[PDB]
Amino acid sequence: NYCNQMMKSRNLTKDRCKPVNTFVHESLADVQAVCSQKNVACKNGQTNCYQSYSTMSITDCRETGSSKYPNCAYKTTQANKHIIVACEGNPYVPVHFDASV
């Protein structure tokens, strides 16, 4: 499926199985734009999180309960949802993907 292929290609699962990851089907600049959208609290207590005004096309890749390295197995779910990212730096850009809603 898409998740198994992309998780491997993007170097998430070549050397382990990662429980969850999200891919966003939008331009890089459209996701970078989220760091000047709605400032929200982060779960970690920090306050450098931002939520997109709009929903975006996203695929969630979630490992199955029985999956184990090397043969990682993913459930694929497609949705249109808002994204929440942590931003840092100069330029002030996304550095972590937090949630989708």
């Binding site: 990851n21 891919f23 966003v24 939008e26 730096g89 550095v95 972590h96 993907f97």
Partner: peptide, 14 residues
């Protein structure tokens, strides 16, 4: 890689 580069590699699929 930078944290920013990692983010784009791990999450973006334009």
């Amino acid at each position: 890689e930078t944290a920013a580069a990692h983010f784009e590699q791990h999450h973006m699929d334009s």
